[PDB]
From Swiss-Prot:
Coiled-coil features, chain-numbered ranges: none
Name of protein: Zinc finger protein Xfin
Function: Binds to poly-G sequences in RNA. May function in post-translational regulation processes.
Post-translational modification: Phosphorylated. Phosphorylation enhances RNA binding.
Expressing tissues: Expressed in oocytes, and in specialized cell types such as neural retina cones in adults.
ZnF C2H2-type: positions: 1-23
Family named by the database record: Belongs to the krueppel C2H2-type zinc-finger protein family.
Cellular localization per UniProt: Cytoplasm
Lineage: Eukaryota, Metazoa, Chordata, Craniata, Vertebrata
């Protein structure tokens, strides 16, 4: 799953969700 904001490919949506801490809109 590509973050869109930094498109790092997170294998699982859980990780993608967690990764938003990095930007959080
Ligand atoms: Zn990101």
């Amino acid at each position: 799953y590509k973050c869109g904001l930094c498109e790092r490919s997170f294998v699982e949506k859980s990780a993608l969700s967690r990764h938003q801490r990095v930007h959080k809109n």
